[PDB]
Amino acid sequence: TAQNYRVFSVHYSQFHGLSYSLSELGTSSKRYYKRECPLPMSLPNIKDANLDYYNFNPMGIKSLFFSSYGDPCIFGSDNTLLLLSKWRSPEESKWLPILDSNMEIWKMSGGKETTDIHVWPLALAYDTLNCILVKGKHIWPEFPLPLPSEMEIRMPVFVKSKLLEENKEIQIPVSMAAEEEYLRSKVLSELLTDTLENDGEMYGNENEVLAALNGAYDKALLRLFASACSDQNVEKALSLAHELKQDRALTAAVKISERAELPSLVKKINNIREARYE
Amino acid sequence: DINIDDILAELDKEVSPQQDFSDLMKSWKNERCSPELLPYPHQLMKRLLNRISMQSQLIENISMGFNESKLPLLCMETELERLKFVIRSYIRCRLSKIDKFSLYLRQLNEDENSLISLTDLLSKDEIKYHDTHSLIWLKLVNDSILKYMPEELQAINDTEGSVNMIDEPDWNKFVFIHVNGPPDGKWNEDPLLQENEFGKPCYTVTIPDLKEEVELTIGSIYVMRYEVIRDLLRDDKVALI
Amino acid sequence: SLPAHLQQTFSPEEIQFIVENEPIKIFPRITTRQKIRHTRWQLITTDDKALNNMVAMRSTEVVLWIALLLKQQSKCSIVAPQWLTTKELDRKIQYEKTHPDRFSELPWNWLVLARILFNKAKDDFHDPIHELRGKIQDLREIRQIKVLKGLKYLNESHLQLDNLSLLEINELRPFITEIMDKLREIHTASLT
Incomplete structure (x- = not known):
């Protein structure tokens, strides 16, 4: 996923493991921020409603994007939005989970363990993830696409x-x-x-x-x-x-x-x- | 535990056209359902005509100024005609109620002991309309009817007839009202406000023809006589739904 | 000057105007935001700061006639409120069926806004339109049953409701006002 001159990538192999690389290529000042540093994300635990998706997307990446200010964000199979903070300084970089969206789904439903609603992420504006709340047994939305709902980020405490x-x-x-x-x-x-x-x-x-x-x-x-x-x-x-x-x-x-x-x-x-x- | 609301609230602190327009529909909705002709908000309507004139020259200057983003111009245009509709409907309703109570208004002008006058109640155009409508109706009924009747019976401001000559507004006409409390958010300055059971405060008013006291809790709608609610409406505590 | 059918009451299109003059949350599909490197909106009956700061695919709050005007353009899509969901309408239906004497805590503009968004926003609802309109009709019918029950208490003194809608005020205004006016006229003629 690239946004302007910034490029963010995720690598996986059996003999290397999961990793990410972030770079800014530009029209000038070619600087690579991080090259194949390991990525803190949980791959899915490998019934047909999930297996129809995991045969198609084995990594569990629902989406991969940048924020509105250029900070990288990833949405893994554990339904948490991970933002990379202080990526410009490689000695102070850290991955901040800012939405454990299953917990806020459980929170807006009044404490009920809810299955039939899922979050399909699209973008992250400042303090707000724009995402379609997909209802049904399937995680992915269908062709009559509804309005993307807004989910305010909450620190998982x-x-x-x-x-x-x-x-x-x-x-x-x-x-x-x-x-x-x-x-x-x-x-x-x-x-x-x-x-x-x-x-x-x-x-x-x-x-x-x-x-x-x-x-x-x-x-x-x-x-x-x-x-x-x-x-x-x-x-x-x-x-x-x-x-x-x-x-x-x-x-x-x-x-x-x-x-x-x-x-x-x-x-x-x-x-x-x-x-x-x- | 420690209650921290006052210190945090005082730490948080460390005429406008939209309110004028909300007051304009407050006057319009209070005018439409009332039997009595309400007092004229002269300053509000003078500010509204000055604002609509400045917007008219603004939109004409931008039309002389005519990338092509025509949606702000469309916002100006429907802005102008919706404001014109509100002003037109308010003045038309109060002109109809002027025409209903012409004899009452001319007696109220004729009575110097009464403190209500058309300078405090009507606009200059409404005063002109009421006056020349009274003369044209007068001339029509003199050359139609009252020329052929004797000296006792040409009077149209008569009182001592078998049926009353002069129209009178229904002072006890039932109207839907919704309580708003005081116009300001500070509740304690109202002397008529009093706290009741179950937390909710109310306004207590007395109907004199039955001699009963009734409680109007804040946040609920009622139907009441207009003479009971006239003093609350003149102090602007309720809204005529 | 005023017509006889607009004399002592509001027409429903005036109610439509009144509820078109409220704020509502909305999703822009155009970007009017000035970058760091287009005539302004400049309105006089609403705050234009939220309209000057109009950002695509965000939540803003604009007035409802602007909402419908831009939905006609499809430059901006209207977001339904919280009470226009199946769960909240089912909660309101359960409150209506629970307390027979009291109306539910619905907004004053619950019929007019629903009609406006049904006839103008046919692709802007997360829940399906079908059961939404079914629950709207169910709430309208049970509120009609409650106002029919409450109309047996037409008193000479006063009469109170808690949370009746403005459109239902124009439903029941001329009948209630005329009947109570004549009851009061009868009792005031009955006074010595």
């Missing part, structure tokens, strides 16, 4: 046991919702910062949405800080507000410390602020 335990529509509690919002905001802030610093902005919207994303980052960190302070956990609260990015939201942590009556936490956060003035 959802355990089914706790969601079944609290719900005696699956409603996520505010603690792990803040946890996934914090993680998703952090990885999306990293991706937007890398694409804006390296490739620049292709529109005018990228700086303001990065600022709002850092805002949603700090709001989720304060909601984790509150659950830390509710359990009289001073050290976890200090570790949570130590990762707080902006100086605007530290005063909110001071007010939560005032509501939780932890004056040593107030003193250490003010020492953090003292380090932050210079």
Whole structure:
């Protein structure tokens, strides 16, 4: 799959194993990012509804594409969307699963173990996978193609046991919702910062949405800080507000410390602020 | 656990044409179902005619300016005719209700003790229409009927007849209303609002011909007499569905 | 000046106009977005920021007359709301059959929007149109049974409903208003 001058490939053989190669050939500046580095994906476990597809596509690749900002994405047989983060720096590159789409399919169905709906991926815009939700016994869509639905990316930190335990529509509690919002905001802030610093902005919207994303980052960190302070956990609260990015939201942590009556936490956060003035 | 909504809400904070158009259909839907002729929103309609004039010169200037992307021009065009339809229907409905209550309006002008006047109630064009319609109807019934009747019975603003000469609007006409609460989102400043059972607040109003108090919970639709709901509609708390 | 059939009520095409003047989620099939290297939309009765930022194969929110106008072009495809699914309509049918005295929590524009999207969007539904229109007709019929049951309580004082649709308000407006007006006239003549 190629997008503009970037080329992304997947190799497999019995004597080499699964791997990927990413390159940017261009009209000039011929640089190859990674050549046949191994690919973290699970091949399918090799009834006729799946065997009609796996005789046709043995690798389990539903789709292979780039994001709207140029980050590579792959959709394996385990129905998870893997994005390659920090691919420009080969010593910091990592593959981030940003959708375990079976889990969100189970989540929108009210906890029912649902089989008759599947995700057929097409594209990834920023925080949104465009994909046809195919209903029926077949994974693939038919010729009267419906409108591709939108699936917001969620970091897979959802355990089914706790969601079944609290719900005696699956409603996520505010603690792990803040946890996934914090993680998703952090990885999306990293991706937007890398694409804006390296490739620049292709529109005018990228700086303001990065600022709002850092805002949603700090709001989720304060909601984790509150659950830390509710359990009289001073050290976890200090570790949570130590990762707080902006100086605007530290005063909110001071007010939560005032509501939780932890004056040593107030003193250490003010020492953090003292380090932050210079 | 720690409730964090106020500090996060105060951290989040760290005239417009669409509202004018929503107010225009609020006036239109309140006008169409009401028996009483509603007060004229003079500033809103003056702003709407100024806006439609600026859009008319804008679309004509872009037509002089005529890649060919004609879909914004089509958006301008159906924009203009749908706004013209709304303004036309509102003025036509209130002109029909002017024609229904000509004698009531001329008595209300003739009574200096009453505080309601056509300068506060009607436009200049509507005042002109009502006045010259009253004179042309007057002249038609003098040279048609009232010339041949004696001095007691040519009066058209009569009151002491066996049946009342002058038309009167149905003040207790039943109308569908949907409560919106206050126009603003801040609920506590309304003195008439009061909290009830099951969480939902209501407005309490009294029907005097039965002498009963009735509760109008926020979020539900009713049919009520117009005299009961007149003071809430003039303060713009309900919408006439 | 006003016609007699438009005197004290709205015509259904005016209801169509009113529900054409709402926002709706939609998928553009054209790109009007300015890149880093075309007359603007510039509307005065709706926010044109979502229309200036129109991106192909994304979710945007535009007004419904623009939605129908662009669906006629097929430059942009209208997305059905959440309540226009088979599961949500079955949930509404179950709520109607569960509580006989109370109407279901349907939107005010549930008949007019359904008719508009049936006659204008024949290829824009994830669920099939067939059972969707069947459930729409079932909800319409059970709401008709509930308003027929509730019309036995025509009171001189007042009468309340919870979640009746605007099109059903124009269904039942002249009959209810005239009958209650004459009942009130009878009782006010009955007063000393």
